[PDB]
Design a protein around this ligand. Structure first.
Ligand SMILES: Nc1nc2c(c(=O)[nH]1)N[C@H]1C(S)=C(S)[C@@H](COP(=O)(O)OP(=O)(O)OC[C@H]3O[C@@H](n4cnc5c(=O)[nH]c(N)nc54)[C@H](O)[C@@H]3O)O[C@H]1N2
Ligand SMILES: Nc1nc2c(c(=O)[nH]1)N[C@H]1C(S)=C(S)[C@@H](COP(=O)(O)OP(=O)(O)OC[C@H]3O[C@@H](n4cnc5c(=O)[nH]c(N)nc54)[C@H](O)[C@@H]3O)O[C@H]1N2
Ligand code: SF4
Ligand SMILES: [O-][Cl+3]([O-])([O-])[O-]
Ligand SMILES: [O-][Cl+3]([O-])([O-])[O-]
Ligand SMILES: [O-][Cl+3]([O-])([O-])[O-]
Ligand SMILES: [O-][Cl+3]([O-])([O-])[O-]
Ligand SMILES: [Mo]
Length: 721
C-alpha cells in the first residue's frame, strides 16, 4: 500500500498558494494531492504534483560545512562548532565595528515564523535594520504602488473575484506559465461566461494571450503611456464614475501636489491615443478597445506581475493601474478590483506583512516612524530607543555594502543571490570580499551561492517542519510536519534561536521552542493593527485550509473585501460611507498623475534591442528543486534566447542557431528560438540555468522608491556565433 496518513499544507512553489495533502507511509512521503478545501479545490499544476521526488531527493545538504579559507573547499564541521563560529563572528564584528557591520538576507520562501525571528534578532537584538530579502527583487514596487494609492499594502480583493469578473486586464504577467492553477481559474470564468473579455498586455505573446480577446504587444517601457491613454478614452467617452471618484478619490499632479478632475483631464492631454500608439507601436484601436472593455464591463479585475514591478518606474506603473480602477470605481465589489499577483509563496506573509525589509517594522509599521518604533519596543520588551531610527541597506545597496567591506558578516537564507541578483559580475566581486564572513542556510548543494559561503547550515526542507505561508490573496495557510528531516537538518526557527542566544542576544527576545510559539507572539504583534490576525490560532490553522486577514477573533471568518463597510472589520459599523480607504487620512484613495518615461538603459544604435528575462513553466527560479525532477528538467534543460521572426529574417539568423547575446556588461552564447513570441526589436532569455548566468547581462538600476531592480529591460545586441 501507499499512504496511511494525509498531512495538510501548501505547495512549495508559486504565490497562487495551492493547498496540498502529502501522503505518508512509514515516515516517508509517497503521494501528493491538492487540498480539496483550500481555494484551489484540490487542483495542482504539474510542478505541485511532482513535489514528492524533490522532498525525497538524496542530493541534500545534511550536515554543517565550513570553508576554512577563501577559495578553499567546504568540509564537514559539527553543529556545535558551526554555531559558536557563527555567533562569535557576528558578536565580535558588532564589538569591533558596530551593529551595521552585520546583515540578514532572507526570502519570501522562508516560513513566516523564520522571517519573524530573524527580523527580530537583528532589529531588536543586534540593533541594526540590515534586514532585507528577495521580495525587494519582486514585490517592492507593488507595495509602493498600494501604499501610495491606498495607504496600506496588499490587494483589497481575493482570488474569489476571478469568478465574478466580467473583464480581465492582465499586464506584465505570463499567468499561464507563472501562476498555472490561477490562469485555469481565469480560463474557466471565460468558459462559463463567453461574454467575459480578456486583454493581455505583454511585449511577448505567451500561452496567456491565447485565451485573450486582445493581445497588446507594446514596446517595452511604454505601458505607462498606454495606461494614461486608456484613462484618456475613459474620460473622453464619459465612461468614468463621478459618483465614485467625487466622494472617494483625491488627485495628485505630476509634482505630487493636490489637484482635481479638471487637472487630471489636462494632464491626460499629453497621452492621446494617436500619439501613444506610435510610442507603444500598437494599432490605435487597441487603446480604445482596452479602455472600453475595462470601463464598460460589469466588473473589471486587473492582474499584473513582473512586467510591471521589475521596472525603474515600477511604483508609478502600479499607481497607473490603480488610477483606472479609481476613475471608473471598478473596485470594492465582487469581480471588480486591482489585484497584484505575488510570485513567491510567502513574500506576503513573511516579508511584507511581517515587515522584514530594511525600512519596515511588523504589521504595517515603519522604521522612520517614532511612534511605531515605540510600539515595537513595548511589544518586544525592548528598552526605549533600541530600534535604530534609519533604514538598513535595501538589497542592491546591501551587496554594495558587502563589496566595500561595510557589511562584514551576512546570513543568506533560502535564496540564491549569486544566481538571481542583477549585474552579477559586480555582485560576484562583492561576494568575494576576502574579509567577508558569509553563512548560507541552504537545502541543495548545487546552489551557486554556496561557492561563496564560508559556512553552511543544513535546514529542514518544506514539510520536514511546520509553519505558515501567506500567499497573494491574504490567505495564511499552515503546513504541518509530514516527515522527519534527513541527516542533521534542523528547523531554521530553532537554528536562529540558538544562534541569537550564543551571540549574546537577550534570551527573553528569542523565547521560542518552535514555530507555534513564534506564531503566538506574531499574532499579538498584529493585534489592533489593520492586519489583525489575532483570530488565527494554531488550532484554527490546523483545522482550516487557510484563513484570510483581517481576522481579529476566533469567531471571525476573515475578510474578503477590504475597505468595505460591513465586510471589513477595520471599517467601523457606523462609518458614514459604504467605502473607507482608512490608509489615507481623509479616507480617500489617490489618483497619481505619474509622468511616463522609459528604461534606465534604452536601446540605441550600438545596442539596438530590448532584452528581457522571464519565467518558464517547467522551472522554478534557479532549478535546485525542479532540476531534481526528470520530467521537469528534460522539458527545458538549458537556456536559450527568443528572437523575433522578422528581426531574424532581416539579419540572417535561423531557428536553432548559436548566437551571441551582448550587453554593456557581458556577452553570452545561447541557442536561438526564432518565432513570433517576442515582438520586433525585443529579445528574451530565461534565468534558470546555472551554466548560463543571464543576470551577468542585466543592469542593476532600481526604482528610486521601492528599490526594485529593472530585470525586465536593458539594451542588447545579437550576432551569429
Ligand atoms: N513556473 C514558474 N512559476 C513561477 C516562478 C518560477 O520561477 N517558475 N516564480 C514565481 C515568482 S517569484 C514570480 S515573481 C512570478 C513571475 O511571474 P511573471 O511576472 O508572470 O513572469 P515573468 O516571465 O518574469 O513576467 C514577465 C512578463 O512580463 C513581460 N514584460 C517584459 N517587459 C515588459 C514591459 O515593459 N511591460 C510589461 N507590462 N510587461 C513586460 C515579459 O514579456 C513576460 O512575459 O512567477 C512565480 N511563479
Ligand atoms: N533576470 C531575472 N532575475 C530575477 C528575476 C527575473 O524576473 N529576471 N526574478 C526575481 C524574483 S521576482 C525573485 S522572487 C528572485 C528569486 O531568486 P532566488 O530566491 O535566488 O531563487 P530560488 O531558486 O527560489 O532560491 C531559493 C533557494 O532556497 C533553497 N532552499 C530550498 N528549500 C530550502 C530550505 O528549507 N531552507 C533553506 N535554507 N534553503 C532552501 C533552494 O535550493 C534555492 O537555492 O529572483 C529574481 N531574479
Ligand atoms: S499554481 Fe503554484 S501553488 Fe499551485 S500547484 Fe502550481 S506551483 Fe503550486
Ligand atoms: O572560521 Cl572561517 O571557516 O569563516 O575562516
Ligand atoms: O514586496 Cl516587499 O519587496 O516590500 O517585501
Ligand atoms: O514602501 Cl516600499 O517596499 O515601495 O520602499
Ligand atoms: O506596505 Cl508595508 O511593506 O509598510 O506592510
Ligand atoms: Mo518573485
Amino acid at each position: 500500500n501507499r499512504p496511511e496518513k494525509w498531512v495538510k499544507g501548501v505547495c512549495r512553489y508559486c504565490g497562487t498558494g495551492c493547498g496540498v495533502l502529502v501522503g505518508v507511509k512509514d515516515g516517508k512521503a509517497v503521494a501528493i494531492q491538492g487540498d480539496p478545501n483550500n481555494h484551489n479545490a484540490g487542483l495542482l499544476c504539474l510542478k505541485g504534483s511532482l513535489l514528492i521526488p524533490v522532498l525525497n531527493s538524496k542530493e541534500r545538504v545534511t550536515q554543517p560545512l565550513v570553508r576554512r579559507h577563501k577559495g578553499g573547499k567546504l568540509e564537514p564541521v559539527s553543529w556545535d562548532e558551526a554555531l559558536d563560529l557563527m555567533a562569535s563572528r557576528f558578536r565580535s564584528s558588532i564589538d569591533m565595528y558596530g551593529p551595521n557591520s552585520v546583515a540578514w538576507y532572507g526570502s519570501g520562501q522562508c516560513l513566516t515564523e523564520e522571517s519573524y525571528v530573524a527580523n527580530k534578532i537583528f532589529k531588536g537584538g543586534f540593533g541594526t535594520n540590515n534586514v532585507d530579502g528577495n521580495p525587494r527583487l519582486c514585490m517592492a514596487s507593488a507595495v509602493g504602488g498600494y501604499v501610495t494609492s491606498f495607504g496600506k499594502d496588499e490587494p483589497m480583493g481575493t482570488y474569489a473575484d476571478i469568478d465574478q469578473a466580467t473583464c480581465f486586464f492582465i499586464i506584465g504577467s505570463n499567468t499561464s506559465e507563472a501562476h498555472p492553477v490561477l490562469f485555469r481559474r481565469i480560463a474557466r470564468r471565460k468558459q462559463v461566461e463567453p461574454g467575459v473579455k480578456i486583454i493581455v498586455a505583454d511585449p511577448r505573446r505567451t500561452n496567456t494571450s491565447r485565451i485573450a480577446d486582445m493581445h497588446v504587444a507594446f514596446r517595452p517601457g511604454t505601458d505607462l503611456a498606454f495606461m494614461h491613454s486608456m484613462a484618456w478614452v475613459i474620460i473622453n467617452e464619459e465612461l468614468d464614475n463621478p459618483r465614485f471618484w467625487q466622494r472617494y478619490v483625491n488627485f495628485m499632479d505630476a509634482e505630487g501636489k493636490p489637484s482635481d478632475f479638471e487637472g487630471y483631464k489636462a494632464f491626460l492631454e499629453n497621452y492621446r491615443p494617436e500619439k501613444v500608439a506610435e510610442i507603444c507601436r500598437v494599432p490605435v484601436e487597441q487603446i480604445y478597445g482596452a479602455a472600453r472593455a475595462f470601463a464598460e464591463s460589469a466588473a473589471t479585475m486587473s492582474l499584473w506581475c513582473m512586467g510591471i514591478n521589475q521596472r525603474v518606474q515600477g511604483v508609478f506603473a502600479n499607481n497607473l493601474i490603480h488610477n483606472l480602477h479609481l476613475i471608473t470605481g471598478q473596485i470594492c465589489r465582487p469581480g471588480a478590483t486591482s489585484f497584484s499577483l505575488t510570485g513567491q509563496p510567502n513574500a506576503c506573509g513573511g516579508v511584507r506583512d511581517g515587515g522584514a525589509l530594511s525600512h519596515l517594522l511588523p504589521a504595517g509599521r515603519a522604521i522612520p516612524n517614532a511612534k511605531h518604533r515605540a510600539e515595537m519596543e513595548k511589544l518586544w520588551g525592548l528598552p526605549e530607543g533600541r530600534i535604530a531610527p534609519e533604514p538598513g541597506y535595501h538589497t542592491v545597496a546591501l551587496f554594495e555594502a558587502l563589496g566595500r567591506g561595510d557589511v562584514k558578516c551576512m546570513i543568506i537564507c533560502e535564496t540564491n543571490p549569486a544566481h538571481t541578483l542583477p549585474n552579477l559580475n559586480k555582485v560576484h566581486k562583492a561576494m568575494s570580499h576576502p574579509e567577508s564572513f558569509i553563512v548560507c542556510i541552504e537545502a541543495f548543494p548545487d546552489a551557486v551561492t554556496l561557492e561563496y559561503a564560508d559556512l553552511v547550515l543544513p535546514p529542514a526542507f518544506w514539510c520536514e517542519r511546520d509553519g505558515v505561508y501567506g500567499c497573494g490573496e491574504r490567505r495564511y495557510s499552515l503546513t504541518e510536519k509530514a516527515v522527519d528531516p534527513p541527516g542533521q537538518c534542523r528547523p531554521t526557527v530553532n537554528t536562529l534561536v540558538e544562534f541569537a542566544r550564543r551571540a549574546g542576544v537577550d534570551p527573553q527576545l528569542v523565547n521560542f521552542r518552535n514555530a507555534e510559539d513564534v506564531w503566538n507572539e506574531w499574532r499579538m504583534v498584529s493585534k489592533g493593527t489593520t492586519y489583525d490576525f489575532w483570530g488565527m490560532t494554531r488550532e484554527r490553522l490546523r483545522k482550516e485550509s487557510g484563513l484570510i486577514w483581517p481576522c481579529p477573533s476566533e469567531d471571525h471568518p476573515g475578510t474578503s473585501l477590504r475597505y468595505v463597510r460591513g465586510q471589513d472589520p477595520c471599517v467601523p459599523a457606523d462609518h458614514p460611507d459604504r467605502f473607507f480607504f482608512y490608509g489615507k487620512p481623509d479616507g480617500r484613495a489617490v489618483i497619481w498623475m505619474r509622468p511616463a518615461k522609459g528604461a534606465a538603459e534604452e536601446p540605441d544604435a550600438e545596442y539596438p534591442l530590448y532584452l528581457t528575462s522571464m519565467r518558464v513553466i517547467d522551472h522554478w527560479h534557479t532549478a535546485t528543486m525542479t532540476g531534481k525532477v526528470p520530467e521537469l528538467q528534460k522539458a527545458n534543460p538549458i537556456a536559450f534566447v527568443e528572437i523575433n521572426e522578422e528581426d531574424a529574417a532581416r539579419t540572417g539568423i535561423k531557428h536553432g542557431d548559436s548566437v551571441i547575446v551582448e550587453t554593456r556588461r557581458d556577452a553570452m552564447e545561447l541557442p536561438a528560438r526564432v518565432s513570433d513570441v517576442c515582438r520586433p526589436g525585443l529579445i528574451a532569455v530565461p534565468f534558470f540555468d546555472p551554466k548560463k548566468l543571464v543576470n551577468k547581462l542585466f543592469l542593476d538600476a532600481t526604482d528610486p522608491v521601492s528599490r526594485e531592480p529593472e530585470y525586465k529591460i536593458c539594451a542588447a545586441r545579437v550576432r551569429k556565433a
